[model samples]
Target: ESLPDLKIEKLDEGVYVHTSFEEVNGWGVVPKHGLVVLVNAEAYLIDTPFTAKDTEKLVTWFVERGYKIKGSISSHFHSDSTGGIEWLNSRSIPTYASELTNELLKKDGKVQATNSFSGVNYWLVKNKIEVFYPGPGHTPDNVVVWLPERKILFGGCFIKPYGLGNLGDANIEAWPKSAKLLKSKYGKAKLVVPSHSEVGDASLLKLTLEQAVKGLNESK
Candidate 1:
């Protein structure tokens, strides 16, 4: 069998779940964690797919299972995290994000978020799907969602891969508390899915927390 990366694609009573990635300009490629939940009457969605092309693929993947993406959510506010909003919008698909992200996007200008440091405003967040933003971590708009008893944490770019969370654009200063908060809220989730690397269990949090602690120590 070919080694594939369809992390976890499962459907139960029409609710479908899976993970995938998309390319974002010069940022290499990034992963997007998400799912399609069917609640008897309505369909709900988790994180977005990254780009129009990627979104197309995601749509295709789920449609094959007799499901359609009724709505979408962005894990955070980074451009790499929520770029597909425009396309999603075009299709009238709603998206959710922190209030700060909404404020940042508007405070800045019209268009998708840019990677510039100052461009990080509070309006970058728009809520069509219902998103909650606690505070700054990777970039001040980081938020995680808990699924249908799945208790999955989809933290877009705010959370990274096997390579210890990235501090490049991250608020290295606040990641520790952020990590701790997320861990506490979820409390031993069945799965811990990062937005940019291999899916893992709580050990991934352990690794990320360890790295965050090390970074904090070095800074001190």
Candidate 2:
């Protein structure tokens, strides 16, 4: 696979969106964005590049910028969420995710997470790193991360891009409920980061909920 360049976009003081290019099944040569939250010299990665080599580039880019990745949190079991686990584990950096994510990865014969949590887990709380489970949406294990100080929410695959209509690998019945949970929990967030599209404000949650409901009604 050809390695894509990593591009960094700074959203706040210490919050950034790192976009890595990769070709998806339906979307060819697309850019996949992830979160990088920094505290002092340490950084916490919310997701990773789709390929290990690209992840290595991401890691190196952070190091060169004087930030050391303390750990990583995956939103789900998907490659776009945890593909960098190999590089992280090789560097002895701990990686975490929801217990359901761990289970799904194991069942799918993928890399198991280093640590797992049942639900809402807080890491680097003082710096405002929070992982919240909003029930099932895109997948049973989908989770979101919130940076309160920056008022930014990372809404993984559960929250689709604006104008999106379909739910890929969705539990459609549970999606609306899950999206509502996300809106209630992080509606005050200033910036909402979706796993595959342009970042928007808290309103993105509502838009996603609409999409979710559309899918649910269509399925019925």
Candidate 3:
């Protein structure tokens, strides 16, 4: 079956969103989102594609474009997020993430991030890229990365597109509250980017919040 090619599009001067696909057992072909933020010749990844090969392709794109990856961070411990951490780490690029994420990854038998956060908030690039863990939602260790100047919020799998795509690792009861926390924390964000669907404005966060509430109530 034919599938979409891994593609990257510039969201701003030095920021891009990359899309990759995974043909899952029940999900069929699913699209995944990741970020490539650049500071001059240095690049940073928000998440990897669905696999290490795909992640290699993602990184190759940047390398071919004359940029060197400085670091990366998975939004959570899921394969979609951390699939490429080992690949990046193998290349001597440090991967940063939350402490909880590493613990979960370790237990799940996946590669742990080379570097973990000290607290809820950490800066990959001061005043530019801010990583924050606003408690649990899609996954217990999920985190969101905020690009302050670009006003973009990479909500990861914790923030879905049109539906509750997967709940195998989610905390439905706490998701709505987490979304509210996100809405309040990054109130000025112009875009909300998620892992499994189209990238849209902060209205997407509002919709996700609405769905989170509905999803929580329905879960009971």
Q: Write the per-residue lDDT of candidate 1 for residues 1-220, one digit (tens) a residue.
A: 2223444466444445556655545366555566566544345556555566666666666567575555565566655456566777777665655555655556656244322222222222222122334346666667665553444544555555345455555677777777676666555656666766656666666666666766667778
Instruction: Extract clashing residue pairs from model 3.
Output: none
- For each candidate, what TM-score against the reference? 0.71, 0.93, 0.95
- The digit string of per-residue lDDT tens for model 2 on 84-195 reads 8878887888888789998998998888879888856555455578888888878888888888778988987777845442345568898889888788878898999887
Model 1: which ten-residue window has the lowest total lDDT? Answer: 120-129
Q: Rate the local accuracy (lDDT) of all candidates.
A: 0.56, 0.81, 0.87
Q: Tell me how candidate 1 scores on lDDT.
A: 0.56
TM-score of candidate 1 versus the correct structure, residues matched by position: 0.71
- Name the top lDDT candidate: 3
Instruction: List candidate 3 segments past 4 Å from native.
Output: none
User: Which stretches of candidate 1 lie above 4 Å from their native place?
Assistant: 1-8, 11-31, 60-68, 107-134, 164-168
Q: What does each candidate score in C-alpha RMSD?
A: 6.4, 1.9, 1.4
Error of 1 at 112 (Å): 7.0
What would you estimate as the lDDT of candidate 3?
0.87
What TM-score number comes out for model 3?
0.95
Point out the higher-scoring one by TM-score: 1 or 3: 3
